[PDB]
Design a protein around this ligand. Structure first.
Ligand SMILES: Nc1ncnc2c1ncn2[C@@H]1O[C@H](CSCC[C@H](N)C(=O)O)[C@@H](O)[C@H]1O
Length: 373
């Protein structure tokens, strides 16, 4: 459906008094949680901090009325904030300065998992000065109640200030000293293709604590098709690199790998993973191929695209992955993609490459395609 032009296109949408840029892959718009926040938040003090900005809809009401800092981890969303002219920093929630804010706005990043959420909760508690306030928004169907009560335990006072369907916004006040940030880094050893690796990652990464079965299947298929030395000295693009499940092995195999990842936490995870294993590769914080030059081309492109649990529809970002792969590959170059059995990638590859091959069919399927000039 979406073309590369359309995926990377930044579209400004109107709202009373201004405009806000949104784009495919950027969270925040058409989101009930952020929408309820926008209708609830009001100025308090002089310094505010948004720990889950997205396109900036939730804390927009504070814009122009008090100093507002936005810590964004999504490159896609960051592009939007930048285009909208909204003060924002490429940073993790827990990188927020302690005791420097009067107000904190936080739409619960439930989709990121409990670890990421709790880290954000403590970050908010630490960022606030004693007496500071926190606007916490969420979905009761997505743990709002649990996190709200945990937030209350961390700060003290806290009550719901707005309701709409299962969506909620609570306002809490820091009455007690915040605890230290919990340990954020995790590490686990894994063997891939007969080699040992030690992966390091922060909260919220895909397949935390273990190498994903699908990722392993892709590498197995790749080695069978190209051989153990098949990627040596070759330029490889890893779409959605994560903490490096595919990136590290390929780099160790001698390839010159470029990993593009939209999530900041995942990017830092990849960087430390490479360092810890004495491997070198480009860990780019990028919305698909946004960070690349117009001329950049590759010999091999691999990917374990994002997907919705239990869904049979390919995500826009995933579709973009395929479009970019086809456009970024040099004639004769090869594309490797792994996905659950419920995603209709075949007709997509057929369209973009003209033909494809199924290398493996198990719990997951590994598809292959060669770029024709
Ligand atoms: N717009 C985007 N641009 C780049 N990467 C993205 C993206 N949207 C999602 N991703 C990342 O794509 C990865 C898909 S999950 C797989 C991760 C890793 N390749 C592995 O095999 O373990 C995740 O890291 C997800 O955060």
């Amino acid at each position: 459906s979406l073309t590369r032009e359309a995926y990377h296109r930044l579209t400004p949408l109107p709202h009373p008094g201004g405009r806000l840029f949104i784009k495919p892959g950027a969270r925040g718009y058409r989101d009930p949680v952020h929408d309820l926040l926008q209708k609830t938040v009001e100025p308090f003090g002089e310094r505010a901090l948004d720990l889950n900005p997205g396109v900036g809809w939730g804390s927009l009401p504070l814009e122009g009325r008090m100093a507002v800092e936005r810590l964004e981890t999504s490159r896609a969303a960051f592009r939007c904030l930048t285009a909208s002219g909204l003060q924002a920093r490429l940073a993790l929630p827990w990188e927020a300065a302690a005791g420097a804010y009067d107000l904190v706005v936080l739409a619960l990043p439930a989709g990121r998992g409990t670890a990421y959420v709790q880290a954000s909760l403590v970050a908010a508690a630490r960022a606030l000065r004693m007496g500071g306030r926190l606007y916490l928004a969420g979905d009761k169907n997505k743990g709002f109640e649990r996190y709200f009560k945990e937030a209350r335990a961390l700060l003290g006072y806290g009550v719901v200030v707005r309701r709409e369907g299962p969506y909620r916004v609570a306002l809490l006040e820091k009455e007690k000293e915040a605890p230290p940030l919990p340990s954020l880094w995790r590490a686990f050893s894994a063997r891939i293709l007969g080699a040992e690796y030690t992966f390091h990652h922060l909260p919220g990464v895909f397949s935390a604590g273990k190498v994903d079965p699908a990722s392993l299947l892709l590498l197995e298929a790749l080695q069978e098709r190209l051989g153990p030395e098949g990627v040596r000295g070759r330029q490889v693009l890893d779409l959605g690199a994560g903490y490096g499940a595919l990136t590290l092995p390929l780099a160790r195999m001698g390839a010159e790998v470029v990993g593009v990842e939209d999530d900041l936490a995942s990017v830092l995870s990849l960087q430390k993973g490479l360092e810890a294993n004495a491997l070198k590769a480009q860990a780019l914080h990028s919305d698909v191929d946004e960070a690349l030059t117009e001329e950049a081309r590759f010999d091999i492109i691999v990917t374990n695209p994002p997907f919705h649990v239990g869904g049979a529809v390919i995500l826009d970002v995933a579709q973009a992955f395929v479009n970019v792969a086809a456009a970024r590959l040099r004639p004769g170059g090869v594309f490797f993609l792994v996905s659950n059995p419920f995603l209709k990638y075949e007709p997509l590859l057929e369209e973009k490459f003209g033909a494809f091959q199924t290398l493996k069919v198990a719990e997951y399927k590994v598809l292959f395609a060669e770029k024709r000039g």
